[PDB]
Amino acid sequence: FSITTLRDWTPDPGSIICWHASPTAKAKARQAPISEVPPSYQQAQHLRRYRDHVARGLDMSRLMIFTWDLPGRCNIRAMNYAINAHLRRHDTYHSWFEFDNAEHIVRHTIADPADIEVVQAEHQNMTSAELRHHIATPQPLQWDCFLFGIIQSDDHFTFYASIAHLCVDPMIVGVLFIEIHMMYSALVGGDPPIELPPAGRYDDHCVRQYADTAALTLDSARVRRWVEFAANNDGTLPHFPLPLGDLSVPHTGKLLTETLMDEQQGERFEAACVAAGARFSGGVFACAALAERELTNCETFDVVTTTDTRRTPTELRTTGWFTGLVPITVPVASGLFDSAARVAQISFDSGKDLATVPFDRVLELARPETGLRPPRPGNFVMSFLDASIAPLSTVANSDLNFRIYDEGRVSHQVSMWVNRYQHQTTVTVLFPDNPIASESVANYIAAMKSIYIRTADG
Amino acid sequence: FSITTLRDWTPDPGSIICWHASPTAKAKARQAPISEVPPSYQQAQHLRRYRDHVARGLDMSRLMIFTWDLPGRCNIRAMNYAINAHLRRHDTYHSWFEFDNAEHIVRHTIADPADIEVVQAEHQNMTSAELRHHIATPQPLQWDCFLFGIIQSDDHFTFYASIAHLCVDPMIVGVLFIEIHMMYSALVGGDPPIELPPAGRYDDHCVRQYADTAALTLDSARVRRWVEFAANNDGTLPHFPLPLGDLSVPHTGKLLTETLMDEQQGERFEAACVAAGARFSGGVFACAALAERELTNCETFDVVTTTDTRRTPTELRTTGWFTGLVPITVPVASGLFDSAARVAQISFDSGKDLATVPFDRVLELARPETGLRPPRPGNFVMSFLDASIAPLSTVANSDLNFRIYDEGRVSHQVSMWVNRYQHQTTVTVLFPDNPIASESVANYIAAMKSIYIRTADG
Ligand SMILES: [Zn+2]
Ligand SMILES: [Zn+2]
Secondary structure, eight states, X not given: OEEEEGGGOOOOSSEEEEEEEOHHHHHHXXXXXXXXXXXXXXXXXXXXXXXXXXXXTOOBOOEXXXXXXXXXXXXXXXXXHHHHHHHHHOGGGSEEEEEXXXXXXXXXXXXXXXXXXXXXXXXXXXOHHHHHXXXXXXXXXXXXXXXXXXXXXXXXXXXXXXXXXXXXXTTHHHHHIIIIIIHHHHHHTTOOOOOOOOOOOHHHHHHHHHHHHHXXXXXXXXXXXXXXXXXXXXXXXXXXXXXXXXXXXXOBEEEXXXXXXXHHHHHHHHHHHHHTTOOHHHHHHHHHHHHHHHHHOOSEEEEEEEEEOOOSHHHHTOOSOOEEEEEEEEEOSSOOHHHHHHHXXXXXXXXXXXXXXXXXXXXXXXXXXXXXXXXXTTBEEEEEEETTTSHHHHHHTSSSOOEEEEOOOBOOSEEEEEEEOSSEEEEEEEEEOSHHHHHHHHHHHHHHHHHHHHHHTO | OEEEEGGGOOOOSSEEEEEEEOHHHHHHHHTOOEESOOXXXXXXXXXXXXXXXXXXXXXXXXXXEEEEEEESOOOHHHHHHHHHHHHHHOGGGSEEEEEOSSSOEEEEEOSOGGGOOEEEEEOTTOOHHHHHHHHTOOOTTSSOOEEEEEEEOSSEEEEEEEEEGGGOOTTHHHHHIIIIIIHHHHHHTTOOXXXXXXXXXXXXXXXXXHHHHHTOOTTSHHHHHHHHHHHTTTTSSOBOSSOOOOTTSOOBEEEEEEXXXXXXXXXXXXXXXXXXXXXXXXXXXXXXXXXXXXXXXXXXXXXXXXXXXXXXXXXXXXXXXXXXEEEEEEEOSSOOHHHHHHHHHHHHHHHGGGTTSOHHHHHHHOOTTTTOOOOOTTBEEEEEEETTTSTHHHHHTSSSOOEXXXXXXXXXXXXXXXXXXXXXXXXXXXXXXXXXXXXXXXXXXXXXXXXXXXXXXX
C-alpha cells in the first residue's frame, strides 16, 4: 500500500533483532555444485545490469523491502521457525550466480535445502541511519541476498524483509503474508506449522522459458511484432515522452505518489470502461495515453507494461521473477476516452501472448539490418495492479500497516505503478531526481488524474 | 520402415497370445472418479470426430498399429511384466473420456494405477482375418483402448501393438523400443527391470495448454497469423491441389509408397540445401512446392505439416499426443531450388512457434466477420521425418523388422510422409481409394521425385 523512500523511513526506537545466514550455511553455499538450469531472462538481464553498475562505481537498485507492524512482544523462536521455513521452501533461495571468464552466467544450487539456515542476533547499538544502510546491503552476486528482522519496541514490534529482486516479484507480498504472518500467528497461537501446498519450482520455469525462446526465430510472428514495436520507437523500447534532464549524471530515484480516484469515482470509472467495451485496465492505459496527448499533442502512445506470466496452478504457487513485458500502443487521434479505452484494451489483451517473449531474445535474433538496440536511460515502464481482488486485497484490506520502501538508488527510467484498491486508486512514479524530470512527471500525473476524474464524472 | 494396409497383412501362422484388461481392471476403471484435467485440444478434436463418425454410421481411423519380429520363444512372464509396467507408467493410460448430457467431454482418472492390469489369453483357432479385425477394434471411447500381443511361431514370434491415437503419437515407437524390447532383454537375461527416468505426465500438458490458449485473443499475433493463412486458403486449411473423387461416399484409405533417393543422393541433397541457405526439411517442402508448380502452375504452395510440440525435458519423457500443425507457405514464381528451399526453411522454422496454437482455438476466437469455418473433406497434410538421427534410427537400424500398419478405414484427406533413413529417402501417401485420387497422387509423386533427383545430381 504505502510506498516511501528508505531514507525517509524513521523506525520506532527499539531492539533490532536480525537474521543472517549462519557460517555453516555460507560454507555449504560456497561449495554448491554447478547447475545446468540457466538464469531466467529476467535474472540474466538483472545480473548483467548489476555487474555493469558495479563496474561503473554505481549503486544499483536491486531489492524489494517490506515492513509491517505487530502488537506486543515478538516470539523469537516462532519467528525464527517461520523465516527459516520460508527460505527452505522456495528454490529461488537455493541458487546463486556468478560470471565466469567472458560474460557467461553460471548457476550454483545447494543440493540439500536443510543446509540453509539463518540465525538471529541483536544489532546492539545500531542507530536508525545504520539500520537504513544495513537493510539495503543485500546484492544479487551473494547467495544470502536477503535480510529479515524485527524492531522490538516496548509494546509493539515491526517486521522487516529485504529480498533481492533476483529471487522474487510482487507475488512475494502475498507469500510473505502467509508464510511469515499467518505461520507466526499459528505458532504463537499454539498450533503446529500451517500446512501448505507444495511450492512450485522456479528452476522449471527457467528451463521451459529457454526451451520456448529457443523455438523462436527472427521471422516468428511474435518476434516480428516486437521488432515492429521497437522500430516504431527508434529501434528500442519507448522513452518517456517528456524531458527528464541530463541522465548522464547519476541522480537517485525519487518517488511521487498521488491518489487518482476515491471509491465512488472508481466504480463510475469502471462503468465508463464497460460502456466503452473495455475494462478497468484498458481505461488505465487510455488515461496514460490521453495524458501524453494533452501535454505533447501526440497521435499515438507507446509504452511497455509489466505483467505476471504465471499461468498454471504450479506457477501460481511459484516464488520468483515471472514479470514479462507487454508492448502497449494506443492511437489517440480522436482524443475521446471511449475509443482510446477500446483500442488500449485490445492492445493489452492481445499483447499478453507477447509477454513471454523476452525482448533480450529479440535482440539476440535481430541482425544489423533489423536496426534494433537496447534502450538508453529514460525508458518508460508502466504497471497496473488490481489490489482490490487479488490476494493483495487480503494484505491491503488487513489491519497490518503493510509498507513498501524504495531504496532510493540511482534511477535511469520512469516507472509508473497504477494501483487499484478497495477504496481508492493511486499512482506512484519512480524517476530521476532532478528539477526537469520532477516538473515533467508532476505535469504528466496532474493531467492523467484530471482525465481519470473527467471520465468518472461524465 | 514398411507401411502396409492392415487388410494386406498376412501374419505367420502361430499361436496368438493376446493381453486384455482384466474384468476387475475394467470394472474399477468404470467407476473411476471425474478429473478436472481436460482432454488436450488434440484429444478433444479426435473425440468429437469419432463421436460424429459413429453417429453418421462411419468407421473412423483412430489407431497406431505396429509390429516387430523376435527370434525364438517368447517369455510370457517377462512380456507380461513389460506390458503391464508400460501401462502403469504413463498417465495417458489412466484416463478415459465420455460425453455428458451436454457436449462436454468429461475425463475420468483411475486413482491407483496399480489397479490397471492386462492378462494374456490364447485366441485359439483365431484366423488371420479374425486377427486383423480384432487388432483394429480399439476405439477412443473405451478406457482399455489398446491391444498388445504376440504371434508365436515354431522358432520366432511377432510382437504387435495397437494403441488408440488418443493416447500416443509417433514418439511411442521409441518408448516401446525401450519399455518392451529393452525391458524384455533385461528380464530374460535375469536382470531386474531396467531403470527408467521419471515419466512425464500428460495431464500437466493438458492443463498448461488450456492456460496458454486461454491467454490468446482474436487479435493476438499468432492467432492473426493462423487466420491469415486460412483466409489465404479460402477460409480453411489447405486443400489438396488436385481433384479427388466423390467424398460423400465412404471409400477407405489407400497407400502409395515410393523411393526418392539413395544414400549418396541424400548426402548430396543435404549439401545442396546447406549451400542454398536451407536444410533438408526446407528442401523437402521446396520439392513438394516445386512439384506442385510443374503440375498446376500455381503461384504459391500452402500446406500444413506436423511437428512435435514437446520442449522441456519432462515433455520429452511424456507419452501422449503432442503433435501440432505448422502452416507452410512457399512462393514458387522463380522455379529455382535455392530460393524455394530458403523461403520454405524460413516458413517451417518460424512456424514452429505457431504449432502450439491449436486451430480449434482459432475457430473459437474467430467471428463471422473473420470468415472462417472448420475444414471440409480433402485437406492436405505433410510430414518430414528424419529417421537417421531420431530414436527411429535405432529401430530403423535394428535387426527387427519393424512395421507400421494403416487400419484402412475411411479417408477424407491426403496425408504425405517424407522419411529420410540412413540409406534412402522415401515417401508414403494415404488418400481416398478411388481412381481419380489415385491418378492425381501418382502424378504428384512422380514430379516430386524427379525434382529430388535433379537437385541431388545434375
Ligand atoms: Zn542484520
Ligand atoms: Zn485379443
